[PDB]
Protein: DNA protection during starvation protein
Organism: Mycobacterium smegmatis
Amino acid sequence: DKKASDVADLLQKQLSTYNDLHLTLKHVHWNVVGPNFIGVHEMIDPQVELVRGYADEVAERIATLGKSPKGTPGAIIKDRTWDDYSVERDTVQAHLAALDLVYNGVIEDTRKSIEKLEDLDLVSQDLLIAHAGELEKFQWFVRAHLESAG
Amino acid sequence: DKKASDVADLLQKQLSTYNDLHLTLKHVHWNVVGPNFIGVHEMIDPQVELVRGYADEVAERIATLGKSPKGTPGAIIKDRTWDDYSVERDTVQAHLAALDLVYNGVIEDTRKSIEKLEDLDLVSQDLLIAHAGELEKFQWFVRAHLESAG
Amino acid sequence: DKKASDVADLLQKQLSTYNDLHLTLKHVHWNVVGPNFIGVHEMIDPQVELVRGYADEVAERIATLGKSPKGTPGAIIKDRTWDDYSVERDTVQAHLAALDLVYNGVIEDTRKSIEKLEDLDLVSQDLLIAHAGELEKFQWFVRAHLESAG
Amino acid sequence: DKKASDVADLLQKQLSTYNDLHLTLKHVHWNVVGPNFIGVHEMIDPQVELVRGYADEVAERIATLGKSPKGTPGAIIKDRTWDDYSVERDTVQAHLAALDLVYNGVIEDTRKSIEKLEDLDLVSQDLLIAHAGELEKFQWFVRAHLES
Amino acid sequence: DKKASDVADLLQKQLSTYNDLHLTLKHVHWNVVGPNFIGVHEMIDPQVELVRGYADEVAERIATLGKSPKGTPGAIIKDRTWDDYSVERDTVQAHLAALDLVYNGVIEDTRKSIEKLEDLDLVSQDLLIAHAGELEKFQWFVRAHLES
Amino acid sequence: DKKASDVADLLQKQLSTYNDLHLTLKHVHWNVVGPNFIGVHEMIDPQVELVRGYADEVAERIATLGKSPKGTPGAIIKDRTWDDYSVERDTVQAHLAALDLVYNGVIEDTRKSIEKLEDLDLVSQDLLIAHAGELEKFQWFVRAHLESAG
Amino acid sequence: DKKASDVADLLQKQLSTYNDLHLTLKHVHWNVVGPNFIGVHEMIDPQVELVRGYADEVAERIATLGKSPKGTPGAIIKDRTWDDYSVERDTVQAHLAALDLVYNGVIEDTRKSIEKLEDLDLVSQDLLIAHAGELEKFQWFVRAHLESAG
Amino acid sequence: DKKASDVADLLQKQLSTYNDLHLTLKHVHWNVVGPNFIGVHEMIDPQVELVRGYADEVAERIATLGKSPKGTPGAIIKDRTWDDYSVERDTVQAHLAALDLVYNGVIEDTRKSIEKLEDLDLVSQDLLIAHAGELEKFQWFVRAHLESAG
Amino acid sequence: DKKASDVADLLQKQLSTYNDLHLTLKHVHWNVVGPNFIGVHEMIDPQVELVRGYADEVAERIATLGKSPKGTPGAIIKDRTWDDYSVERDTVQAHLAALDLVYNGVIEDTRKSIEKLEDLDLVSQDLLIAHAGELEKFQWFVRAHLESAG
Amino acid sequence: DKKASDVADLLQKQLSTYNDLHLTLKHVHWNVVGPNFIGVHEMIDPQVELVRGYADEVAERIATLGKSPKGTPGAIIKDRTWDDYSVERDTVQAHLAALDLVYNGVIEDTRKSIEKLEDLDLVSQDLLIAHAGELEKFQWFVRAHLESAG
Amino acid sequence: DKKASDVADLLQKQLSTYNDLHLTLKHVHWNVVGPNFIGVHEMIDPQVELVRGYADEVAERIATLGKSPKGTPGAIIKDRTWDDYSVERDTVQAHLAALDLVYNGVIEDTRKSIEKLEDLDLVSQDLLIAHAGELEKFQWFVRAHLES
Amino acid sequence: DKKASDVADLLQKQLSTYNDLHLTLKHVHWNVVGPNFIGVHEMIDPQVELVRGYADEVAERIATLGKSPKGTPGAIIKDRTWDDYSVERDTVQAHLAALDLVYNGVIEDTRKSIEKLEDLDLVSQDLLIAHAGELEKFQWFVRAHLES
C-alpha cells in the first residue's frame, strides 16, 4: 500500500485526462467544418480509439494496484485542470490550434508522471511511456496542419 | 430551422445521456468485483460500443440538422439530470441494481422523445426507435442477473 | 393490387433517382480536382456503394409488389429528376455545391414519398425512412465542405 | 404491464411461427430434388439463418417484456393454427408452391401484429416491420421460381 | 436397401432428437436468469449451432440412403418418446439440472444407434460416433456447473 | 496531345458502353424469373461488379490522358450502343438471348478499339485486352444456358 | 513392412481413383451446358477440392507407410479400372448420369477397402471412412438432379 | 470458326501440359525426401494452385471459343509429348533437376504458342503471356536450388 | 463406473505423453540450429499446436468420464515415457533422430490404447484414432529429413 | 560474454516459471467446476496463450544470448518455484485462491529479475517489464473473484 | 542469352528507379505539411507498396534471366541518372510538384523499355506494361492536386 | 529544443541505417541460392517489413521533434559510415555471414543511441529499445544458420 497508493493517485489524474481527452477529441470531430475536414476526421478516429483504450489500461492498473478508478463525468471535472474545450462549430484551423494546446498539457503532464514513477513503479511507468509515444505523434499531425509552409 | 431547432435540442439531451452512459458503463466495468464479474464485463463491453456509436449518430444528426453538438464533460453535467453514478468498487448485485435504475431513466427519456418526434422528424425518431431496442434489451440482461429465481 | 400499384409507381421514381444518383456521384468522383479532392473521393466511394445498394432494394421491393422494375438509361432520363449533371473537370467546391442541390431534391422527394406511403405500405415506407437518414447525413458532409456567405 | 402482456402474447404467437418456419425451411431444403434444387438450396440457407435469428430476437423481446418465451416443440403445436408442412421428397415446383402459401400466412400474421402493436409498443412493432421486409422479399424469390 | 431402410429409420429417430434438442437449447437460453446466466449463454450458443448442424448431417444422410427425412414440428412429436422440456424462466441450476437429464437420453440413444449401425452402416455409425463426443463433452460442462 | 485525344475519345465510347452495360445487367437481374433464375442471378452479380470496376478504370484512364470523362445518363444515351433494353419481367432464356446479342456488340467494339490502340497507346490497349477476356468469358456462360436450333 | 505393404497397395489404388476423379470432375465442370449448369458448377467446385485434398492425404499416408506414391498420368491409367470419362460438351442430364455411374464404382471400391483395412490398419481405414461420407453425399446430390419427381 | 478453331487446338495442347504439370508437381511434392525438402514443399504448393487455376482458364477459354476441352487422363497422355515423370522416392537434387527439365519444355512450348497466337487471338495470347511469367519464375526458384555457389 | 475408470486411467497416460511431447517439441524448436533449421521450425510449430490441443481433448474427456485430469509437472515425470530429452543446442539431424525415437513410443503407446479401448469406449478410441493419424504423419516428416545407412 | 551469462541464467529461471505456469494454468482450467467456472475458463484461456508466448520469447532471448534454453519437464521441476500444484477437481475460489499465491511468487520473481537486469541488459529487462504488466493484471482478475475476510 | 543480358540490363536500370522511387515516396510522406497532407499520406501509402512490390518483381525477373539484381544504396547511385529528390519539410504543393516531375522520368523511361523489350522479351515487356498503368494513374492523382 | 536537436540527429543516423538495411535485406533475398534459400527467403521477409516500419517510426519521430527526416538514397550515402553491402549471387552461407556482420553494427549503433537517449529523451529511447529486441532476435536466426 506504501507507494502503490501514490502511484494509484498519479494514474487517476491520467485517467480523467484521457476520458476528458477522448470526449473532447470526439467533440471536435463532430464540430469541424471546412475544406480539409475529412482529413481531420480521418486523423481523429484512430486517436479516439487509442485514447479510449489507454483509459481502460490506466483504469485497470489503478484497480490492480488496489484503489477504485473513477470514470464518471463528475470525477472528470474534479480531477480536470484543463478547463473545458470551448470551440464549437468551427474550422480546421481553430480546432487544430485549440487541440495542439490541449496536447501541450497532456504531454507535459505525462512526462512529469513518467518522471515521478521512476522510483515508484516501473510497470506503471512503462505504461505511460508507451502512451506518450502516440500522444506526441498525434500532436505532431495536428501541428503539421497548421504549417502552410513551415 | 422551424421544428429542426426543436428536434436538435431533443437530440442534444440524448447525446449527453449517451456520453454519461458509456462513461458510467465503463466505470462499473472497472469497479465490479465478485464471483460472476466476468459475465458482467462480457455484457458491458458490447453495450459500451453500441452506446458510443449511438453518441456519434445522435451527434452527427444534430450537426446535419444545423446545430452544434456538445460532447465535452461540461455539457454532460449541464444537460445531465441523473446525478452522477456513485457506486464504486463493489459487487455485481450493487452495480446491477444501480444500472437498472440508470436505464429506467434512459429508457423512459427515450420513449418520450420518440413520442415527441412523431410530428417533428420521422428520421430522427427512427434513429431513437432503433436505439431503444438495444437500450431495453440491455436493461433486461441486467435485470436477469438480479433474479435468483424470478 | 391497387395501392400496391401506387406504391410500386412511387418506388420506381425513387429507383430512377437512385440510378441517376450513383451515376452522377461517380461522374463527379472522376472529375473532382484541387488540393483537397481526395477528401471528396473518400467521401463519395461509400455513398456510391450505399446508393447502388438502395436501388437494388427499391427494385426488388417493386418486383416483390408484382411490378417490373425499370433500370435502363432510357427509363432514368424519363422519370428524371435534375438537369443532366453539367459540371465536368472542376474544383471541389464547384462540384460539392452542385451535389448539394442534387441532394436537396432527392431528400425532398424522399420526404414526400415517405408521407404518401404513410397510409399505403409501412414496409416500403420503412425502406425510405432508412434511406433518408444516410442520404441526409451525406448532404451534411457535402455542406460541411462549404461555408461561404457568412 | 397490462398493455405489455398483450405485446408478449402477440410475440409468442410470432415466436412459434418463426420456429415452425425455420424447421420447415430446413425440411424443404432436405427434400427438394430436380434439375435446379441447388439454387433453392442457396436461397433457403440465408433465410433459415435470418428466421432463426428472428426467433431469437422475439424470444428475447418477450423476456424483456417480463414474460417467459416458449420455444419447445410442444409450444409450437400449442400456438400453431396452421397445418404441419406436408410435402416430402418432391420437385422444386411442389415445395416452392407450398412455401408460397406458407409465407402468405406468415406475412399476413406479421402485418396484423404490426397493426396491433401500433398503439401498444412502437419498439416491438419496429422489430416486426423489419422482419416483414425480409419475409416478403423471400416470398418473391419463391414466387419468381413459380413463374416458369 | 432393406438394410439401409433400417439405417434411415434409426437416423430419423436421431434427426428428431437433434431438432427437439436445438429448440430446447434455445429455450433454456431464453429463460435462464441468475448471477451467472451469461456464461450458460456462452456455453449453449456453440452447442446450438453444433446440434443444428448435426440435424443437417443426419437429414442429408437419410436422403442419401434414399429416404425422405422429416423435420417439421409434427415429425418431432411423432418420433419423440420423451416429454416436452418443461422448465420456464428459472435459475441456471434448474435448467442445467433438467438439461443434464435431457442429455442422458440423447447420449444413451446415440450409443444404442452406434451399436446397431455397427453391422449395418459403418459410415452412418462414424457420423454418430463423431456427434457423441461433442454431446458428451457438452453434458460435462452442464454437470460441472451443478457441482457447486 | 493529339493521339492522346483520339485514345481518350475511344475510351469514352467504351466507358458509356460499360455504364449502359451494368445498368442493363442489373435491369435483367431484377427482372429474370423462371425455375432457374437464381443461377442467372449468381452469374450476373460478379459481372456487374467487374463492369462497374472497368468503367472506373476507363474513366480514370481518360482523365489520366487529360480529358474529362463523361458518366451522366445523357452521356450514355448519346454515345449509346444498343436499343434501350426492352425485356422486362421475363424468362431466363428470353433475357439471356438478349444479353447474348448485347455482348456481341460490346466484344466487337472492344476488339476494334484494341486494334486501333495497337499503334496509339499500349497501356490503354492492355486495359481493354484485360477487359475483353472476362467480357468474352461472360458471353460464353450466357450462351452455355442456351442450346437450341441444333 | 508386413501388412503395411498390403495397406500401402490398397491406398495406391485409391490414390489413382481420386486423381482420375478430380480430373474427371473438372472435365464435366468445363463441358456441362444447358439451363441448370450453374448449379452443377456450384456443386462440383467444392467436391473437386475435397477429392484433391483426399489425394494428398492418401498419398502422404502411402509415404508414411514406407512406399512411394504415384500421381503421374501413367500411374492413373495403369491403376485405373474405370475406363476414361467419355462424355464431352453435353447437358446436365448426360453428365450427371455418367457421374452417378462413376461414383458407384468409387463408393463400392471404397467400401471394400474399408472392409479390407479392418484388420490391417485402423488409422488408414478411418481415413477412408471419412472420405466415404463425402463421396456418398456427393453422389446423392448428383442423383437428386436426375429425380424430376422421385 | 476460322482461326478460333486453330487457337482452340493450341490451347488444348496447353491444357494437357498444365494438367500433366500439376499432377507431376504434386507427385514430386509427395516423393521428395532429404534435409531441405520442406522448402521444396513450400515452393511447390503455390505453383500447384497457380497451374491448376491456369488449367481452368485455358479450359474455359477453349469452351468460350467453341470447342470442347478435355481434362481426362486419356487426353493428357494423347496430347502429352513429355513422356511421364519417372523419378520417385528421391532427394531434392534429383527431383529439382528433373523438374527444371520439365519446365524447359513447358516454357519453350508456351513461348511458341504466344508467338503463334500473335495473329490469331490477342486475348488468348495475353492469357498465355501471363502464365509464362509465373512458369518462368518458378523454374528459376528450381534452378536456384541446384546452384550451391552459382 | 468401472470401465470408465480404466478408460480414464488410459487417457491420463496419454495426457502426460502429450504434455511431455509439446514441452519436448518446443525444447527442440529453441535448440535446433544448422543450415536448414528453419525447415524444422516450420515443421514443429503446427505440431505443438496440435499436441497442445490433443492434451486438451484428452484432459476434457477424462473429466467427462468423472475423473480429475492431472497436468502438473510432477504428474508428467511420474507417468513419464522417455528419458528427459537430452539434446540441447544441436544440429537438425541430431534433433530429428531423437524426435523420431520419441515418436516411436508415442505411436506405439497410442496403438495399444486404441486396441484396449476397442471394447471399452468407442468415443475415446475414436479420439486416439484421430490423433494417431497426425502423430504418425509427423514422424514421417521427421524421418523424411533422415535418409542414411542406405 | 560474462554479464550475458548471468542474464541468460536469470531468464532460464523465468522460462521454467513460465512453463510450470501454463502447465499449472491449464491444469486448473480442466479442474475448475462450480456455478461460475466458465467465467474462469474465459479468464484463463488468453493467459495460457500469453504465458506460452512469453516462454517462447524468454527461450529465444536466452538463445540469442548464446546459451541453450532448457524446456524439458526435468528442467522445470529442477528450477521449480512452487509446490507441484495440489488442487484437483475443485471449486472456483479454491482454485483462484491457489492461483493467487502462485502469481505472488511469479510477480515477485519478475520484480527482482527486473531490478537485477537494470544494470545488465535493458532489452531483456524491457521483456520482463512488458511481461510484468499482464502477469500482474491477471492476478488482479483472480483476486477480483475473491473478496472475503472483510 | 546475349539477348537476355540486354533485358537484364534494362531491368536493373528499372530496378534502381523503383528503389529510389519508393524511398522518395516515403520521404515526401514524411515531409508534407499543410491543411491537406493527410490525403497525400493516404495517396502515397498504397503507391509505396505497389512500387516496393514492383522492385521485387523486376529483381526476380533479373535473377530469372540469369543475372544478379542490385538493390543496395550504392547500386541506386551507380544506375541513377536523375538528381536526388531535394524537397524537405514543405507544402503539399511543393512535393506534389516535384513528384510530378519525378514521375515524368519514371514513366518516360518505362515506355522506352517497353519499346525495346518489344523485340527482346515479350514477358519482361508485359511486366513493365502492367507497371506503367499504375505509375501513370498515380501521376494523375498527383497532378489533380496541382490543379487548384 | 537544443536537447531535442540532439535526439533528432541521432535518429537520422538511425533512420539511414534502417533504409540501407531494408534495401540490403531485399538484396540478399534476391541473391541467395543453394539447397535452403527458401527458408532464408521466409526469414528475411518479415524482417524487411519490420525494418521498413521502423524506418517509418523513426522518421515520424524526427518530424515530431521538429526536424525534417531524410530518406533519399543521397541521405543514406551521406549518413552511411559502413560499406555498401557487396555480396552478389551467392550461397546462403555467404550472405548470412555478411549479414551477421551487418547486424553487429546495426545493433552496436542502436545500443549507443539507447545509451545517449537515456538522459535526452526517454520516449525516443523506448522506441529504439523496442527495435533492438527484434534486431538482435533476427541476428540470432542468421547465426543459427551459420552453426552448421
